[PDB]
């Protein structure tokens, strides 16, 4: 598990 990836595009 990881913190939600924070870059969307």
């Amino acid at each position, epitope marked *: 598990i*990881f*913190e*939600k*990836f*924070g*870059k*969307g*595009g």
Partner: antibody
Amino acid sequence: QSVEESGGRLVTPGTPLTLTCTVSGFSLTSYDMSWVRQAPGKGLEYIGFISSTTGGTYYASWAKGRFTISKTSTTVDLKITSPTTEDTATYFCAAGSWYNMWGPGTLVTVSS
Amino acid sequence: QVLTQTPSSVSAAVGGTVTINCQASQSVYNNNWLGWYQQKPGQPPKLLIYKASTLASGVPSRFRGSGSGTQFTLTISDVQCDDAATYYCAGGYNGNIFPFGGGTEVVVTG
């Protein structure tokens, strides 16, 4: 449309200082807002950013504690909590998930 | 957690071709979270390529991005004096890790 950093100045080691990033022609919250620095003659180094998707603030592992990122009504701010000689650099702010739009940079000089 | 950018310096004559490589220690996010930037001395960086292979608006077609997973490539065809700069890759990983590569100087020879 532009981003502009401010706050670069000469400080003695240990003197805290805050840089600001101001956006023109779009909203502070529309896009990822990042702080990157570049020591003289060296490479780019990511410090941290505020996500437009999660709303969260993230730091590079090396930068945790050394920098604090916060926002006002009109700026994204970077506080250098206890500057060292090694923090002498140009600080850039950038908008967009891909660092799409960069400011000109503001220079921090840490010396006596 | 590290992007290894090679070589450190590269030369082409005007009209030549340059290759710059970026190797991740593990797979980047979604196998394609890798961007390429150009920086001239005294100026901020400019985005060239995002999502490994997408050209940014206004960027010349002679800049091409390729690769996926751990291995990425920027090529410059028909090299111009204007292309003399430092180029950086920048990647993204699960865990919100966003390293820059260490940069490649391009010297345009004649």
